[PDB]
Symmetry: D2
């Protein structure tokens, strides 16, 4: 529940299903340490990545594997993957939803940060 | 349930709350006939606009009153309102969600069309 | 050039060429009067719609005929057209660039406004 | 000019000026080698990063330093930077324009690719 990813397909107007998502956390030596991963569900969502206890303050990267999604559809894409890099902050609202809207040569990403 | 609107604020990373939304349907003389309206909830969503029986095939317009949302925040905006104009089709998936992502000088809108 | 429209295609990563654009201006009786129209060039841009002298203060609507663009590429898109509605020149003359980035089931519209 | 970066500010409706941009290229050992860097001009554009000769096939990463841009405007944004990762020149030389549209809690990134 503190980190959710939602991915939509702007070409088909649908959730983007079965997209691989890898989360990393930035280590003290500046490398990216694997943190969590999964595939989006039938509703384009990936829940259950981490817990409140482990999602401590720090810098995280969410990679969304957009190229493999488009290739499966036979559509030749621009980006290798979409990247979302941010600092997790204890002060603000407690839930972070990372949304991504995908097109072959463009994507947007937005963070919705809310309280239950 | 066949038509839902969801609105997000890209400046604050939050749902856009208390945004007025007016839906129109295009009449046989080409004018826009009021159809439904409401304000987005605390989660940025507006449900309950119409029913399956009345949401027949035709051209609809969804106006989102973005200027009043930004003015309330003290932020001077570009657009008078965001407009979403589309044909409702019985053939495709049965639920239409119109999403809008708002910034003072830009917005995106996406249609997610799915089956329950 | 006080008003310029630029349209890009997010499926192909290219300018959206030969897209029809209609501009209207709200009259004192509340109707939308035809103001100017044209088609985007090879660069996806439409210049020459108006002059400083004719582009007076007002509420303008830029209608970008996105459905016909997609149909001619074999795509059946969600929206009929993208509309951009804004007050212009209400604090003196400005230059406006209205951009639209198109995908079949999504678009974004942006304005860059500069003071000559 | 085979690689050009353009950055716009969706809060102000303006070019995003003096944004730092770092370009990297993936080496055969998988590390990201520094390739070129610069800052956007008054127009929000960064030209002159590379030459046809140096811009060979490869996987490139364009890192746009959006956090520092917002902080200097008094805004505490969500993302550390926007990353754009793509394979270039894998079917011969192309021209690439990488655009980013920024808001505090959202960005979109787009590419227009043309064949000289
Ligand atoms: O939405 C993006 O990712 C940036 O796209 N917007 C673009 C863009 C994108 C590209 Cl690749 C080239 C030019 C523009 C442009 C020019 C004027 C204006 Cl007002 C907007 C834009």
């Amino acid at each position: 529940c503190p980190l959710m990813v939602k991915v939509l397909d702007a070409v088909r107007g649908s959730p983007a299903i079965n997209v691989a998502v890898h989360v990393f956390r930035k280590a003290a030596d500046d490398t990216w340490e694997p943190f969590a991963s999964g595939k989006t569900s039938e509703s384009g969502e990936l829940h259950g990545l981490t817990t409140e206890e482990e999602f401590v303050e720090g810098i995280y990267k969410v990679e969304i594997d957009t190229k493999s999604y488009w290739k499966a559809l036979g559509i030749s894409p621009f980006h290798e993957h979409a990247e979302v890099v941010f600092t997790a902050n204890d002060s603000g609202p407690r839930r972070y939803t990372i949304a991504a809207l995908l097109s072959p040569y463009s994507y947007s990403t937005t963070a919705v940060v809310t309280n239950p």
